Design a protein around this nucleic acid. Sequence first.
RNA 1: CGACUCUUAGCGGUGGAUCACUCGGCUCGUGCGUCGAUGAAGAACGCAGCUAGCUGCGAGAAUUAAUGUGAAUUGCAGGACACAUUGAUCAUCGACACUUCGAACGCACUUGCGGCCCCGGGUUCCUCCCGGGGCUACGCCUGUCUGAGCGUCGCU
RNA 2: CCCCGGAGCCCCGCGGACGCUACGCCGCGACGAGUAGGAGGGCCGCUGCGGUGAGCCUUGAAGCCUAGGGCGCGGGCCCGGGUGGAGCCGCCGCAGGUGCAGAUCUUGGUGGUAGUAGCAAAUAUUCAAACGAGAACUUUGAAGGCCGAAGUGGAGAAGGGUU
RNA 3: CGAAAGACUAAUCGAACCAUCUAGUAGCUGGUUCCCUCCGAAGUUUCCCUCAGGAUAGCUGGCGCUCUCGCACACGCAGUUU
RNA 4: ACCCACCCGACCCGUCUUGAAACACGGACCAAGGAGUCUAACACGUGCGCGAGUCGGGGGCUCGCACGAAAGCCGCCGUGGCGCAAUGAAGGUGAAGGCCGGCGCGCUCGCCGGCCGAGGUGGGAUCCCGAGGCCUCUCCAGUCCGCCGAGGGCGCACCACCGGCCCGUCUCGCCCGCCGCGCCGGGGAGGUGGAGCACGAGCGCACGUGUUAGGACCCGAAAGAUGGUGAACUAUGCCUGGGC
RNA 5: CGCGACCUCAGAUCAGACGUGGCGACCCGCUGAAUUUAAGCAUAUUAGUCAGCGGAGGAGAAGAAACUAACCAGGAUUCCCUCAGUAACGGCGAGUGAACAGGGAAGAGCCCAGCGCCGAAUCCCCGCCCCGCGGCGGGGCGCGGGACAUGUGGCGUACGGAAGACCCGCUCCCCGGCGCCGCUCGUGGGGGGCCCAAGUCCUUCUGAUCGAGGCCCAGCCCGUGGACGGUGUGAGGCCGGUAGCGGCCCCCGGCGCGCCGGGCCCGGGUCUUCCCGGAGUCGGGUUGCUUGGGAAUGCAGCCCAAAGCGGGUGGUAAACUCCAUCUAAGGCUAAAUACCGGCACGAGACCGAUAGUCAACAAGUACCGUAAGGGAAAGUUGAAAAGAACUUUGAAGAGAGAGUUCAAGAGGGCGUGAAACCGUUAAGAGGUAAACGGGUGGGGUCCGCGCAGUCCGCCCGGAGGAUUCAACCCGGCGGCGGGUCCGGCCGUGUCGGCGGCCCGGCGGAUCUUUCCCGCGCGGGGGACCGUCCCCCGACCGGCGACCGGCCGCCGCCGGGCGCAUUUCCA
Lengths: 134, 259, 210
Amino acid sequence: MKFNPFVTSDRSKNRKRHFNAPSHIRRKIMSSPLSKELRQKYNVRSMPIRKDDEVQVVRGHYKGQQIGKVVQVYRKKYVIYIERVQREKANGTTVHVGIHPSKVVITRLKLDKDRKKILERKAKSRQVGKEKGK
Amino acid sequence: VSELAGHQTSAESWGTGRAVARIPRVRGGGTHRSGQGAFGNMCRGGRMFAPTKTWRRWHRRVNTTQKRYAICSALAASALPALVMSKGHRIEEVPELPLVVEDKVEGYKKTKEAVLLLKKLKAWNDIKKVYASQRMRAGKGKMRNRRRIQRRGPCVIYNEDNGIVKAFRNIPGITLLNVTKLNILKLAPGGHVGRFCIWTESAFRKLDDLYGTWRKAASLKSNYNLPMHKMLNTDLSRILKSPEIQRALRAPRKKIHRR
Amino acid sequence: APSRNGMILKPHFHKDWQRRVATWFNQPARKIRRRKARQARARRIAPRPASGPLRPIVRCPTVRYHTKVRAGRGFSLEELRVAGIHKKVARTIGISVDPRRRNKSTESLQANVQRLKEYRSKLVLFPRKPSAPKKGDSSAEELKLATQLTGPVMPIRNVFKKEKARVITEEEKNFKAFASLRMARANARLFGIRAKRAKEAAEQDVEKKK
RNA sequence: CGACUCUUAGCGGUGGAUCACUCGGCUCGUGCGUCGAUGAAGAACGCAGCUAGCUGCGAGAAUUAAUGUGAAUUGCAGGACACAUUGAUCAUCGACACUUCGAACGCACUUGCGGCCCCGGGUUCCUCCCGGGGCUACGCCUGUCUGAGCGUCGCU
RNA sequence: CCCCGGAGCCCCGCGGACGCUACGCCGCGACGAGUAGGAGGGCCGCUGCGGUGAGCCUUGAAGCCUAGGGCGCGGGCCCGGGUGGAGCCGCCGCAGGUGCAGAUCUUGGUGGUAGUAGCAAAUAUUCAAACGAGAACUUUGAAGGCCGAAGUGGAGAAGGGUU
RNA sequence: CGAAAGACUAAUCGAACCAUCUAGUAGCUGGUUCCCUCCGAAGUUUCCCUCAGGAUAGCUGGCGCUCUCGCACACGCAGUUU
RNA sequence: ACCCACCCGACCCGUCUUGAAACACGGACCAAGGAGUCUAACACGUGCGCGAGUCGGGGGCUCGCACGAAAGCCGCCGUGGCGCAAUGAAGGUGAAGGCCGGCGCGCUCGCCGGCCGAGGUGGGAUCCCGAGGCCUCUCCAGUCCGCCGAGGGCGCACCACCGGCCCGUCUCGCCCGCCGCGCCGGGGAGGUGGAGCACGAGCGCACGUGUUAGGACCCGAAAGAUGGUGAACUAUGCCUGGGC
RNA sequence: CGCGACCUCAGAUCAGACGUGGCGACCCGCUGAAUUUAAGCAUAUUAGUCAGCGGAGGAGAAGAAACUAACCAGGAUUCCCUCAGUAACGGCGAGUGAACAGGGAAGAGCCCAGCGCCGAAUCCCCGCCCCGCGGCGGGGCGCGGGACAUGUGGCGUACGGAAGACCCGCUCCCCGGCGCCGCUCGUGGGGGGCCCAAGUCCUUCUGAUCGAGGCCCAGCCCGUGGACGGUGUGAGGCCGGUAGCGGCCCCCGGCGCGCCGGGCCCGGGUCUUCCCGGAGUCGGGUUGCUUGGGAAUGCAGCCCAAAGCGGGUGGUAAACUCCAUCUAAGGCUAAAUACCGGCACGAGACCGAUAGUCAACAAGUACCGUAAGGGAAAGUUGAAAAGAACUUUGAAGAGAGAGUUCAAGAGGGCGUGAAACCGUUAAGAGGUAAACGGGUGGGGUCCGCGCAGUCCGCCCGGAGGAUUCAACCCGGCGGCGGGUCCGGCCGUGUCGGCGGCCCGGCGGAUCUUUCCCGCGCGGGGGACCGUCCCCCGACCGGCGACCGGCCGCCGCCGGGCGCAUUUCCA
Ligand SMILES: [Mg+2]
Ligand SMILES: [Mg+2]
Ligand SMILES: [Mg+2]
Ligand SMILES: [Mg+2]
Ligand SMILES: [Mg+2]
Ligand SMILES: [Mg+2]
Ligand SMILES: [Mg+2]
Ligand SMILES: [Mg+2]
Ligand SMILES: [Mg+2]
Ligand SMILES: [Mg+2]
Ligand SMILES: [Mg+2]
Ligand SMILES: [Mg+2]
Ligand SMILES: [Mg+2]
Ligand SMILES: [Mg+2]
Ligand SMILES: [Mg+2]
Ligand SMILES: [Mg+2]
Ligand SMILES: [Mg+2]
Ligand SMILES: [Mg+2]
Ligand SMILES: [Mg+2]
Ligand SMILES: [Mg+2]
Ligand SMILES: [Mg+2]
Ligand SMILES: [Mg+2]
Ligand SMILES: [Mg+2]
Ligand SMILES: [Mg+2]
Ligand SMILES: [Mg+2]
Ligand SMILES: [Mg+2]
Ligand SMILES: [Mg+2]
Ligand SMILES: [Mg+2]
Ligand SMILES: [Mg+2]
Ligand SMILES: [Mg+2]
Ligand SMILES: [Mg+2]
Ligand SMILES: [Mg+2]
Ligand SMILES: [Mg+2]
Ligand SMILES: [Mg+2]
Ligand SMILES: [Mg+2]
Ligand SMILES: [Mg+2]
Ligand SMILES: [Mg+2]
Ligand SMILES: [Mg+2]
Ligand SMILES: [Mg+2]
Ligand SMILES: [Mg+2]
Ligand SMILES: [Mg+2]
Ligand SMILES: [Mg+2]
Ligand SMILES: [Mg+2]
Ligand SMILES: [Mg+2]
Ligand SMILES: [Mg+2]
Ligand SMILES: [Mg+2]
Ligand SMILES: [Mg+2]
Ligand SMILES: [Mg+2]
Ligand SMILES: [Mg+2]
Ligand SMILES: [Mg+2]
Ligand SMILES: [Mg+2]
């Protein structure tokens, strides 16, 4: 259960805070888990996805083992566009079919200084939590 | 329902002399709601018959002796495994139904150790039944923060808080009750009196310091003795097959004399 | 229309009472708020008693009750003068002081003075500075207590004295109670009329001499 | 066999009832309990590359700066940034800014007519004209200045 | 002059249902109208809640249709087929905004009337050509007309606000 | 306000329109939503500014109690007769 | 169960009414909504707990409230409500006699020591004693399983009556006591009024019905009051123009 | 013929400040009806109510007695319960209707004028130096101004006060600046930001699992985390979060310590002498409103108009006489209290698009009225627009193909798509309007059989087969019933040790202060009574509250049991 009386835990209110969330909260909602090699290397469970991360599609009709780069992260519909995850229209043009990032695993990150300090902060928090649980 | 609901309109009724029938209708306007109808339970919009009030007698207070009597009956039917199986608790490997465990049960701080204790006490089939009975609620309660339902499991009675409340906390079905703070709504949920209960040693010894025997006072309460039976020997089969009654009974008349 | 043997009732529901219904759904939250304010006050005054200052021995007026002993508004100034405590020092000590109370008796005065002496005996007065000045208490009787007193300080127990069964004499057996009560009623009724008769009889005795 | 009329069933139309969903109400409870001449509430008018309404904003006009966060916005174009750089977007917002009416303040309410100083064009203060900047509401409080009185007095 | 772990019987005083949800089962006798009204039983129906069914469900929930099989005196209910796509029901108890045929009832929709009444105030239109897929109404040419300078003309005010 | 008609006062005038009290009151009309079973009426007495209505008796339903027993063995009661 | 055919019956539902198929009223059809609810005071009946007691109101102590604004507890466990005592306008008063013996003239009255201890009659469900009868494979004796028990009782509840007691009021008369001897206080007998006593029965919660006050089953007026908006129409006066 | 002071009154775009107005749920001061009821109505009632006007605050108001009471007297105000639907008011009709006391929540006390004593010892503004100067504060330097004797400041206010006399033990409060250590209970004060566990494992349906099965213990792990939401379905482990006395980085606040500049030489008791009280105010008459207040409860208007052992009150008007209780006509003050407005939140036995707010949606919007005002209707494609490319008829709207999707039998007002109504097809019928009830008959759409359905369930006889075992013994295990109650625990009714009573707590309206402690009281002791327990022995019910042996019986497992027994197919 929840014991904090400030946490919402309401049906319509949580749906409101989900579907009317601003962009910096949508970035945290649209986070995806990492592969087992990346989890062993960084001790990081999940990360928000970026413009040019490498992605395997886990569930859906477009399920496969192909590592596809993200085309772009569209945070209004809570979706991402990947390179080879596309589909031909009636007029022959290909449109990228969006996949929700919960059905998305990261195989390679695009590392900059902000992502390095985020992963170091999360690894430090995991180390403090493991020391408190030990 | 709010007092302003239905009477925010200013609808004076068209009287006699027109084809309308004596309904308070909206005065003037070039609107869809213009001479339409309000101020009645039969009208679209408007207010209903008997607006529900906040000053309804919502709450009920019971006599203290009746509450103590019902909670003593609930504690008495927490025994008697024919009343526990008819409640619906899987019991088939429970070694003794007044299940009294050590005082080291409050010393646990891990749900893994609590699950292991329930498995060694062989009461884990009730929690397994709760996992099997986790399904969706029927009706309009899903949009009213009442989405999921499950059964009630082994009610655990603890004396002191040393981690037992933190331990039997995410295991679905277990309700924790303090010894001096026993709840009728958790000892007999839904009005049905039987309930599978797991006691501790310092709870099973403190029940005698709560309610006593018939020849001793409550000793923690001010003025409360145990109630008396209306009849003591309820085995009326044994009573009627005893020779002291059948010596005085006569011969029956069971020859079916039909027409 | 009343019919077939009911009470002749008078309900007071002829005003606009539904606008003025005072629903009491606030009151368990109000008990929680009073509990939180009381605990915050008890944490504020940390060595002091949580209930408050000492209340005197006070007997009920209005001969209905006439035997119960209550807690008072404060100790009176004659009680403080006999106990030897100044009225502006007693408020700083923690003794309730009100200047309105009379003191017509002697036994209630002496009882409140004995309560003030017992309270001054059992009170531990902490010094202001860590460098202890005069009229203070020892560091042993600084370390030996750090807790409050849950409840009213020196609670007033309405206790009755235990009597001994007597060996009744013929004098008390020959006393008549109802006749004495009726004679007291008659004397209280006719005390002034007989005084008027004695006055006019003395006036006639003076007029006989004159 | 006809045409037409009635009933039933299959299918197709008018219609939106039932059912299931709900970023919405209603009620109860808790914490705070804060507007304004340093210009409130409200109203009018404008502001987007393509913009009608809602929402947001004020000629700095779909927002400015700072901080937090960290790769977008999006319906389509476009251009910035190298996201190895105070750095796109969002939130906080404590700095800046906030047209006109409005208690509404120069007088009235047509956006009409003014008065007093200063500056820039006109000019080299010498008066017009134009633009910009600061004042000009009522009642009242302390003090200052100017006063009035065949109101009360000293010298002549 | 014996026991019924068995005299063997229309009765077994030896334990004693197939018949026993004892709030159950069974056996006789009489009776059965009904408004206003009163009482009782609903394993009749709707909604939500506490328990309960190791309940049902994308290998198809609710809802809807049915020229199918039925049950109950009845309220209604259980299946069979089709549509549907996501929740639903039985039992023990609790609660209510709980059952419609009417109220010149409220809202919404649709019929007969009915392809009917009507498109009749101020005299009037006709021929040829252009455009177009399409001409009685548009345009152009010609003819005949009307308003007849207190006009069916040319311009303002109030009002409308882009017409 | 009316050279006067109770005329006009925004299609409203023998007292305009809008909002509130207000869901004003009505002994007066209309309507009042599932099944089965059992019992089942009155338009009469008296009073009331009572005559379209109430109260009170009467008629009615439900809840019961106190007793008797076709198990070898009945006190009382009638829209009845003598 | 869908349609058709035949024979007999068969006027369109609701309502006001003595009487409706009515030339009485509402009504084209269909879907949805739609009308006896909630609080308080009572009254009666029922379910439960305790019992001359009952109830915790309100408040306080425990858990930080998921479940909770739940539950548990209280030298507050009784401050207080109701009941346990009523009757008078009120000052006030306020519910027990009987049997035995003694002292005054037993004077149907006053005063002292023991007992029964809440009266009596009738009708009274149940219970006790219960003579005797019924037997067994045979006659007597005979503890026992029994059933029916003629007759007599203590008599539950309840009803009728006669008594007795308390308070208010009326009549006739006497007696007793003192810190203050009085316009003192108390007592007897007999009428009568009371919602009284006569070895308790109430309290608290819940359910059903009925009567109310509240919007009060739902829809409905002609009205009244308060505060505002209109002389763009029209009524009239004025100012400034126009026309015949 | 003027000047200088004071007093009254002006003018300023004078220097510096305040108020205007809005919201108005709660609060205060007024004003203030009528519906309604009384079965009419007129007092009454609705009702100090709706409407109207002004005023603030986070609460407001009230508030420390010109009090309640009549008692062994209580002691500010506010709020809850009770008093109590009572006392009382009322065409004494309908109806209205408090208060004291008591139990609680909270609890906080005070300042003036006057009386007086201190050399105005007091206060406001401007110039300069020092401190931070973003709720302009402190010290000093100014024959720098002003207010003020028509009275500022200190002592001092009804609880008495002041000045002397001279007993007592003696020395800590506040203001303006600066720096420093403890993160400062909801278990880190408040605010903000970023984070913190475990399966997308294998197989398998689906369009897609979040479905189902399994995973060396119900399943693999985490659980101080199995609330919720999203993700193509029902997700503890996919993600955000969730729990936590978990972490990390800034801002603000109250606390303690140290330093400087400052202000203050501020007490208690006895005795001597003085002082001490708010005027058009109380009160009286009259009038109106109000109240439960009734020979006038409160408030106002007029008239009269005070006194000081006085005055007010003591619920019936008045006179006389003893009492009892307060000190009016000046003022301040948190807490317990109320909140349908606003900001931030949480919860629901509430409603689910004719419901719930008028408003789930571009809602006080479109629209109507000159205006005050009135005031709607309107949710759903799909998982994702993948929203139908292209060919062909038509000018096009419209179609026919083709395509997408599991599905358009979901095609931009599109989730399911009822009834009324309409069209078409099939069937039946038709001149007493249609329709209905009872009884049948005929024709249809479907259901249940059936190339005979005679359905079997037991027992017995016969001819075909057959694996084992029952009958009977041996060994082991489990169960039922029970005797002299066999031995022990356990268990109730009585008796015995009154033994636990001090190697047991509680309660008492039974005594003792032969006792102790804190000062005639309270607690702890000491006896007494009541309530709950220890050891063996007997009897009655060994009582379903348990065992270990013994006997009778039953069931299960492994052998000896070879075939007239035993059981299965036809
Ligand atoms: Mg509504
Ligand atoms: Mg449903
Ligand atoms: Mg207190
Ligand atoms: Mg409801
Ligand atoms: Mg209908
Ligand atoms: Mg025609
Ligand atoms: Mg025409
Ligand atoms: Mg023109
Ligand atoms: Mg006339
Ligand atoms: Mg019948
Ligand atoms: Mg009538
Ligand atoms: Mg009639
Ligand atoms: Mg009739
Ligand atoms: Mg008639
Ligand atoms: Mg009829
Ligand atoms: Mg006729
Ligand atoms: Mg009629
Ligand atoms: Mg009609
Ligand atoms: Mg309906
Ligand atoms: Mg009644
Ligand atoms: Mg009852
Ligand atoms: Mg009472
Ligand atoms: Mg009504
Ligand atoms: Mg009613
Ligand atoms: Mg009306
Ligand atoms: Mg009138
Ligand atoms: Mg104001
Ligand atoms: Mg009336
Ligand atoms: Mg009337
Ligand atoms: Mg008002
Ligand atoms: Mg105040
Ligand atoms: Mg005062
Ligand atoms: Mg008081
Ligand atoms: Mg009143
Ligand atoms: Mg002075
Ligand atoms: Mg989900
Ligand atoms: Mg989930
Ligand atoms: Mg996670
Ligand atoms: Mg009045
Ligand atoms: Mg007097
Ligand atoms: Mg008097
Ligand atoms: Mg809708
Ligand atoms: Mg709908
Ligand atoms: Mg709506
Ligand atoms: Mg709709
Ligand atoms: Mg739809
Ligand atoms: Mg489909
Ligand atoms: Mg579809
Ligand atoms: Mg949908
Ligand atoms: Mg869907
Ligand atoms: Mg559709």
